[PDB]
Symmetry: C3
Subunit: 163 residues, 3 copies
């Protein structure tokens, strides 16, 4: 045995109902889940690290075995620092599957202890992505069905402060 | 019954022989076809709205049941304003199919009356895209086989005025 | 018969163990192989033409039937200038396959003598791409397993001179 610790890395820009489903599903199967929010220096997110962590803590903080940490650099160095059992990713489409397969094999070559496990989304979240949500919010669409209420309000406060 | 009205949205940057085939095929199956040319503010097309509408009217104006309108904003708001029966898209490749499936489901959640129908291109236009045509024209290739003659001339006049 | 001459075009930014495998495999099947390094004006490579040719000559110059040339413009014009039998490409993933199929058909329409042959990588290089190697090197990862030693050193000298 040992305590199991899975990292769920992502930009979470912002967190969606799909991410919440995956982290809830993962929190039942592993002892510790780490929502790892990739800072994105030369990468350019709409929401800051602080907004993204806060939105994630607001949707998932009710789960006792879930932590929230920002990271940058090589996912495999973060994996080693965190003493993780595995990385978790969701697979929504064929393009995700092919990229994820390539990355899992590259990461296994950089660190032979590396491991990646995948979840498939429930069909009610299969069409939701952060990118599409950003696009709908920008064009003044209602994203309430796809994201937690706190994210809806953050899109309004992003508007109010400019946008 | 009722009059049927399908929207064919696209950047049409520029219109190709493939788009002409799709709109001709659609004009036989529905009472009204709307060639909906997405303006592309924060999106950056090579040809202006005016050039794109004109090139489209020159290739398709001979069809009595086809209209040409520029739009911006949420495709579902345009769908509602236009009182459309459905959106039409072509599916050339697997990547188109997966994106289109995701968008149709997202749009159905924003508007339950939304509908998307798809056409597959004839094999003689299956390899043609606006993006590839732009690339060939930029590098001084002959695009005559892939686009109407008016688009060929517009590439020459884009050159002459700089390029 | 006739002497056979295949072009292997790419950005080779930088050359990887995967490219070396493909060119070695091709050099056994055709009389002449041309490693054709696309300059990339409005395209933006990390390594210059000179660095890329040099890195390629260092990994592949031991093969007597392999030449190294920079090119820009239309691949079909380069194909005609070089009097080539065919273009060679590797196919790593489904997305490569669909793009390559589209390009082969477009190029056949621009030049009916055009021809494209494809190789599948050995599984030990199936997960390696230039883009991923760039990402790992930027974040200070070790790329030694994926690229020739000369490329490793070039990443160090790219660092030292800034980065
Ligand atoms: Cl994203
Ligand atoms: Cl974006
Ligand atoms: Cl386009
Ligand atoms: Cl472009
Ligand atoms: Cl590249
Ligand atoms: Cl890059």
């Amino acid at each position: 045995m040992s305590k199991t610790r899975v990292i769920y890395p992502g930009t979470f820009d912002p967190i969606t109902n799909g991410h919440v489903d995956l982290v809830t599903r993962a929190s039942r199967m592993f002892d510790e889940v780490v929502v790892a929010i990739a800072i994105g220096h030369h990468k350019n997110p709409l929401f800051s690290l602080e907004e993204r962590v806060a939105l994630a803590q607001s949707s998932l903080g009710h789960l006792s075995n879930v932590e929230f940490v920002g990271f940058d650099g090589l996912l495999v160095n973060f994996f080693k620092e965190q003493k993780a059992t595995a990385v978790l990713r969701g697979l929504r489409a064929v393009s995700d599957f092919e990229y994820e397969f390539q990355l899992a094999n590259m990461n296994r070559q950089l660190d032979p202890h590396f491991e990646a496990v995948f979840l498939t989304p429930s069909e009610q979240y299969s069409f939701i992505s952060s990118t599409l949500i950003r696009e709908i919010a920008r064009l003044k669409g209602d994203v309430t069905k796809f994201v937690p209420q706190a994210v809806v309000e953050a899109f309004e406060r992003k508007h109010q402060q400019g946008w």
